[model samples]
Target: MNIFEMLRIDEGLRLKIYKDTEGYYTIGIGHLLTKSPSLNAAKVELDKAIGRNTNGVITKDEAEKLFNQDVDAAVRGILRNAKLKPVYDSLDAVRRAALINMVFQMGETGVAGFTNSLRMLQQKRWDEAAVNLAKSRWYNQTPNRAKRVITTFRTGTWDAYK
Candidate 1:
């Protein structure tokens, strides 16, 4: 598998924080987003993987591409520690995409920590999935964005970016 198909990236994530055009809540790589995600992306100068002379902001295209490449590998990470691969594979595209988008912000471990929520998805209890999600610190911190993801769980559907 290529780097794009990689998982569990234990790298140096950002420490600084800020907002984008519409000023939605966010963290690393536009991670915890309500919309599809990523824009005004941070830069890596001199065409470097780790960025040479890197400074502040980057691009929508770059960030979008980066985020897209991430999902597959992320799904791999999300299900890697569990014996739940078949269950995850059986989900609808929307359901699968929802989990993929979620793991971007939550990380494999963070999402993995959602035992009740994961259980809900595994058990096919859609409403319980939303409930399990909302009953967490993540929801308290990013209520707006968390609400959107939680809604996806409840509906078993995917949301398009704005």
Candidate 2:
């Protein structure tokens, strides 16, 4: 399945789709979620976040040309941020997916900004990482998401999904 399919986009769901504005398709939220270039833009942005330089800024046209390339890069950053593989190599697929989703919502830089959490993960201190993750700006800003993901990271399950 494609990335959009994986995201499970529906009518009410917002997606970063391509929209033609004055001949330049800008990838943005809202109506662009229904088209091609926006999807492409999301992919490119994902790629850049993971340390892959797609040469230039993400454009609508290059969407299809760099789909999984960007997804892989972005996912890699997420994995690194959550310290999923190195520290918790035994994590289940669901836990890994939840962490990746959290990383995607929170950029790699944003994730890395959690120095305490990274240190906890590096030390294989799951409890400490959980505490640090819960004490993040994300927890302050988006309490619901933070609560859910932090719980998953702590429990190694999606029991907190609501």
Candidate 3:
């Protein structure tokens, strides 16, 4: 499955502002307005996209636009990481989608912390990579999502969409 399909299910589209699990102000498929470069500018962009002078709501089309932008940022972040770049380049689309999804949830820095896991992935040790991922606090914090990502890593399949 595509990253858009995977993330839409994982992140859950929201037209209105909502508090994410970590209590950050998020909207439009997990766009962290709270963490945007400029809060007001982000809000303004959303407002203009929807042709409404409000940050409280966004249209489906507008939300998709934001989702695309966020996913692109996530991809760029993953590619910019020196260690991940080569590994990412060598991965199949399914595994790459899993990597992108993880970065989408936890930024590239957070995923970078999985040093051994990343190494295992580079070595094509799927089981070890999944095991390494499962042993983290991130797994404890979001077991379901983590399991999906881990399963994708382990199977190199589009099981995440299942």
Candidate 4:
């Protein structure tokens, strides 16, 4: 599933998803303070974080400017404490998008704190990834939203509805 489908934000919020003058689909935060990283923004931020841009654009620099240090710290914590180098190293674009969506929702530290699941992904084990993804505190935190995202990633399909 794409991010909108995975997150299940309200229709109003979904309508907020649009291409900026730069021609990337982004969700505006209303104050121009932040925009969802639909293309290049995702690339730049992910590249900065993981040494490559799994997504294509970088749209949320304003928000990153405010919280980048904390976010970086959290990402570093995820990488160091969760042993995420391997999974981060191995993921393709879609898988990376799923992981980044999780991180955006949970913060890098929160997603990385999922030790068992992170370990499974690091091992490149899909069954384990599915199980570990479901075991997250986030699984039940937002109704079935997190579960659905994991399901999409595990099933390698984008048919899930928002």
Give the best candidate by TM-score: 3
Query: What would the per-residue lDDT of candidate 3 be over residues 1-162, giving only the tens digit for each residue?
Result: 688999998999888877788767788898877654455666775676557787578788888988888899999998899977877998888999999998998888888888988999988998988988899998998899889889998998876667
TM-score of each: 0.63, 0.51, 0.88, 0.51
lDDT of 1 by residue, 82-114 (tens): 744655676776577567656766667677677
1-162 per-residue lDDT for model 4 (tens digits): 544434333112312234533344433221121255545554454445434433433345532342345335444654565355566667765666567566655556667677787777766687778876776556755546676567656865655543
- What is the C-alpha local distance difference test score of each model? 0.55, 0.51, 0.84, 0.52
Instruction: Write out the backbone clash pairs for model 3.
Output: none
Candidate order, lDDT descending: 3, 1, 4, 2
- Mark the 10 consecutive residues where model 1 has the least summed lDDT: 3-12
**What would you estimate as the lDDT of candidate 1?**
0.55
1 or 2, which is superior by TM-score? 1
Of models 2 and 3, which has the larger TM-score? 3
